[PDB]
């Protein structure tokens, strides 16, 4: 992360699609490098729905500039999350902040 920043790194990281974000808040049921399974809160479950959100991280996929795009999980097992929280940082991203 940049030691001296402008505070706009979080907005750029969130708005960019390289960073996975939680559609619904809940508790991280299962954390892994390949995939993340999150159990949503009872107030956000739709009727007739399992209530599990599965995020499949893209790992080591070539970009348009022949670079490496990798997503690494940020949250731990059992850590509560809310809507808009970052789950896995994308390339050149640290803790939801842009790191070029």
């Amino acid at each position: 992360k940049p030691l001296v920043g402008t505070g706009m790194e979080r907005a750029v990281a969130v708005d960019s699609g390289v960073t996975a974000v939680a559609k619904r808040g809940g508790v991280v049921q299962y954390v892994d490098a390949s995939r993340i399974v999150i159990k949503v809160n009872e107030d956000e479950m739709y009727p007739g729905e399992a209530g599990i959100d599965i995020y499949n991280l893209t790992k080591y996929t070539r970009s348009n500039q022949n670079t490496c795009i990798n997503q690494m999980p940020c949250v731990s097992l059992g850590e509560p999350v809310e809507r808009g929280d970052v789950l896995a940082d994308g390339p050149s991203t640290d803790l939801g902040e842009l790191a070029l």
Binding site: D32, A33, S34, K59, M72, S76, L77
Partner: protein, 232 residues
């Protein structure tokens, strides 16, 4: 008495922690400490024997850019964590350690089934995290002894023999000392009122004895200087 010089000697070893240490040499004449100090700083930091991890082998891992089920971080992160591991082995320059772990939680360096010779300096050093109950990790760690830093590029360029698929190569940093700070101050010996003493603060990984480190550096310096002494 001007022709003869006083003999410096080690007077005390002050170990602040397992890694941080302080070495005191006394007495010294005028700027001799400087003439020693930087020299020692240019020997301890540059060339020093040390143990480092060279190759890793995991049953479920095909290449360094892959991932394992049940582990939180990538295999490259595992290799990077293993690179910073500090170990001390005596009697030989080749050890094949084995690490077997299962269950929820971190995998510390204490989980390595070490032999009598191999001693782990940082038992609580973290390597990986297992977040699946039905997940087990078995790893073979190859550790050697050397000097300086060499990358895996030189090793693969040497090409002694073909490498079996799944044998990951990591960069070796054999240097066990990461910070050296020398300071020469006034010393109170006899009534000369001009002698000085040198204090060397060493921040290492804890795998090298500071007194043995100073002795090795002095031996290297004397061996190098004997060539100038002989000349032709």
């Amino acid at each position: 008495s001007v022709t003869e010089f006083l003999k410096p000697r080690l007077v005390d070893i002050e170990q602040v922690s397992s890694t941080h240490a302080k070495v005191t040499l006394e007495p010294l004449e005028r700027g001799f400490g400087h003439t020693l100090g930087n020299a020692l700083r240019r020997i301890l930091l540059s060339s020093m024997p040390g143990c480092a991890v060279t190759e890793v082998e995991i049953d479920g891992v095909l290449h360094e850019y892959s991932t394992k089920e049940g582990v939180q971080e990538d295999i490259l992160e595992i290799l990077l964590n293993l690179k910073g591991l500090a170990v001390r082995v005596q009697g030989k320059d080749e050890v094949i350690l084995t690490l077997n772990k299962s269950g929820i939680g971190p995998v510390t360096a204490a989980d390595i089934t070490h032999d009598g010779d191999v001693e782990i300096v940082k038992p609580q050093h973290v390597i990986c995290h297992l977040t699946d109950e039905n997940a087990s990790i078995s790893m073979r760690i190859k550790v050697q002894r050397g000097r300086g830093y060499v990358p895996a590029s030189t090793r693969i360029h040497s090409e002694e023999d073909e490498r079996p698929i799944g044998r990951l190569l990591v960069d070796a940093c054999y240097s066990p000392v990461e910070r050296i700070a020398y300071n020469v101050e006034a010393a109170r010996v006899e009534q000369r009122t001009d002698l000085d003493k040198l204090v060397i603060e060493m921040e290492t990984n804890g795998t090298i004895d500071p007194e043995e480190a100073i002795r090795r550096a002095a031996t290297i310096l004397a061996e190098q200087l004997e060539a100038f002494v002989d000349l032709r």
